[PDB]
Amino acid sequence: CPTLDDTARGAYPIDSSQTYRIARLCLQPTTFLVKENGEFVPTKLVTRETTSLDQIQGELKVNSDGSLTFVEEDGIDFQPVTVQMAGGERIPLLFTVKNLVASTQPNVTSITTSTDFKGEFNVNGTKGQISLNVAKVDGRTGEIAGTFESEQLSNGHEVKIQGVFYASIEPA
Ligand SMILES: [Ca+2]
Ligand SMILES: [Ca+2]
Ligand SMILES: [Ca+2]
């Protein structure tokens, strides 16, 4: 995924008289865990081409409590991946955030390094959950970066996926 400038600093103010969007969201997985014996255990990513989701975008709606809700409306939000268990089994997994709806804490006055987005998405007839932890904000450009963790059910396996993300926020 893209990265922020070395000098990225400061919060990104949100003007309540304006509306905003996520123009781009990129998820780069660093971690695929598969449940075995009730434990999420690590696997090796075997797919050597791009495994990121990117170009994800959509409105940021304002709720009555001042939180923002991201409604995913487009993007490369689905990627088939193959991982390999320690014992050698190669499992195809579906990495996705399709139909993501994720909200911040209340009373949004600015996007900061303590902003979180939490919500749910659809994986071919079941729900997944995801948390985005913003870790860095460029207040000048609207670029943000952080880490994510999702849980879902792809191909008869309960799967956790973790990694890094980049996004850009801008007025509508
Ligand atoms: Ca453990
Ligand atoms: Ca453990
Ligand atoms: Ca944070």
Q: Which CATH number fits the domain that encloses residue 64? A: 2.40.160.30
Q: How many residues does the chain have?
A: 172
169's CB contacts (< 8 A; 6+ apart) are 12, 20, 21, 22, 23, 60, 111, 142, 143, 144
Distance 41 CA to ligand 1 centre (A): 7
10 Å CB burial of residue 172 (0-12, 13-18, 19+) is exposed
The CA distances from residue 125 to 95, 147, 166, in Å, are 14, 26, 27
Distance 86 CA to ligand 1 centre (A): 15
Q: Which residues neighbour ligand 3 (ion) by CB within 5 Å?
A: 113, 133
Secondary element (H or E) of residue 79: strand 78-84
Experiment type? X-ray
Q: What amino acid is encoded at 67 in this protein?
A: S
Resolution, Å (one decimal): 1.1
Separation between Cα atoms, residue 160 and residue 67, nearest integer Å: 26
Distance 157 CA to ligand 2 centre (A): 17
H helix runs in the chain, sequence order: none
**Smallest-distance ligand from the CA of 114:** 3
Distance 28 CA to ligand 3 centre (A): 17
Tell me how many domains the chain contains. 1
CB count, 10 Å around CB of 89?
A: 11
Distance 155 CA to ligand 1 centre (A): 22
Separation between Cα atoms, residue 172 and residue 22, nearest integer Å: 9
The tokens for 144 are: 């943000």
Separation between Cα atoms, residue 10 and residue 26, nearest integer Å: 21
Distance 34 CA to ligand 1 centre (A): 11
- Is the distance from CB of 70 to CB of 103 less than 8 angstroms? yes
Distance 103 CA to ligand 3 centre (A): 14
- Domain containing 110 equals 1-172
